[PDB]
């Protein structure tokens, strides 16, 4: 079979990959690395008016996650950005101009969900690139489907990316997994080739 | 022995489980998922008046963790809620009404502790369910002991949960592991069967 040394090697390398943001690819949409949401170019946030923050017994305001959370690595149930219905979009100014080669979308696992369902997850989606920051018409980079029966983190590689570069990318959600009120986005990542 | 494919399979599944909040069970006490502490129904917080926050050289206030931290997934030394002495309690409004089937309690590991001791950890505890939100007398669901010599995360399954459902649960700490001043609670989780 396998030697003990081979087992240690397999385990070490699997934990290395796990530690590298799970997938081992630089994320040009990570906010701490220099990416940001373009607030006016995102869907309206679905607000429930339920999470009330108070201080000294004084009600202050209701807390809802803004689109910024999709560019942050804190994926736990409820740490997601929600928009109303099954169609929505977010636009991100990447940390650098890149040739985009892949995107990653993740959702919470079924095992951490009541009744093992994730109907608020995005389903069909499309990625668009915008040449400059204030331009109206994007270029389609690819169309993909987040599989509710797949792994929580799903990476999608473009079949044949052109040589075009972009610093502005749109995540366009076309359908969801059936939730009748909203769609929840946990984390979106963009991968590719920077200047060198 | 085992094949290389079998090793990869074992490793993959262990990392899957690790990624699912370590234990692969939905947590109805997680604050981001919709749970909250009932502040007036918790022990007084032990305050040390040591962690002083300042701005522009102006002392502002002392920082202590409130009971909310036991419903958050950020377990590192000192990220715990403390009450005075070895007896205390916290009451949580769960995110949904459930038939409770298990609870999880975790503490920091001995390996991350000075002198390899965790004397502030809870020891004997009891779980109570409350039928409605403002009701005086809880129903005992079970009594358990957090083992200081066990794994940091310990899940306890009720032997024979009734069909009763609850949205309010009390964690009642009866003893600690010997700390003479306080008991520290890092994270408490509640698992069970929601409506479907």
């Amino acid at each position: 079979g396998v030697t003990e040394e081979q087992v240690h090697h397999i385990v070490k390398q699997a934990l290395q990959r796990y530690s590298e943001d799970r997938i081992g690819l630089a994320d040009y949409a990570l906010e701490s690395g220099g990416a940001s949401v373009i607030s006016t170019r995102c869907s309206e946030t679905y607000e429930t008016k339920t999470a009330l923050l108070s201080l000294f017994g004084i009600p202050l305001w209701y807390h809802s996650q803004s689109p910024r959370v999709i560019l942050q690595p804190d994926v736990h149930p409820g740490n997601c950005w929600a928009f109303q219905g099954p169609q929505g979009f977010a636009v991100v100014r990447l940390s650098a101009r890149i040739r985009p080669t892949a995107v990653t979308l993740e959702h919470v696992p079924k095992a951490l969900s009541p009744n093992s369902t994730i109907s608020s997850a995005p389903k069909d989606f499309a990625i668009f690139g915008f040449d400059e920051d204030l331009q109206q018409e994007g270029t389609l980079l690819g169309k993909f489907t987040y599989d509710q029966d797949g792994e929580p983190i799903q990476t999608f590689h473009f079949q044949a990316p052109t040589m075009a570069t972009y610093q502005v990318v749109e995540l366009r959600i076309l359908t969801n997994w059936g939730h009748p009120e909203y769609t929840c986005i946990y984390r979106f990542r963009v991968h590719g080739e920077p200047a060198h | 022995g085992v094949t290389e494919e079998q090793v990869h399979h074992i490793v993959k599944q262990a990392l899957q489980r690790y990624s699912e909040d370590r234990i692969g069970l939905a947590d109805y006490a997680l604050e981001s998922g919709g749970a909250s502490v009932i502040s007036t129904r918790c022990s007084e917080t032990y305050e040390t008046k040591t962690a002083l926050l300042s701005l522009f050289g102006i002392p502002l206030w002392y920082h202590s963790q409130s009971p909310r931290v036991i419903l958050q997934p950020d377990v590192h030394p000192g990220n715990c809620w403390a009450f005075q002495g070895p007896q205390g309690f916290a009451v949580v409004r769960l995110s949904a009404r459930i038939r409770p089937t298990a609870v999880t309690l975790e503490h920091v590991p001995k390996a991350l502790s000075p002198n390899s001791t965790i004397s502030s950890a809870p020891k004997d505890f009891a779980i109570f369910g409350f039928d409605e939100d403002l009701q005086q007398e809880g129903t005992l669901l079970g009594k358990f002991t957090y083992d200081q010599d066990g794994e940091p995360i310990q899940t306890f399954h009720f032997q024979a949960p009734t069909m009763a459902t609850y949205q309010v649960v009390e964690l009642r700490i009866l003893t600690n592991w010997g700390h003479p001043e306080y008991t520290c609670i890092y994270r408490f989780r509640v698992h069970g069967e929601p409506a479907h």
Binding site: L52, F56, Y182 | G33, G34, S36, E47, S66
Partner: peptide, 17 residues
Amino acid sequence: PRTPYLVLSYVNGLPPV
């Protein structure tokens, strides 16, 4: 002054998940 604590209560059901 007194140690402040931001309290979070859910008053209108579940947040989006």
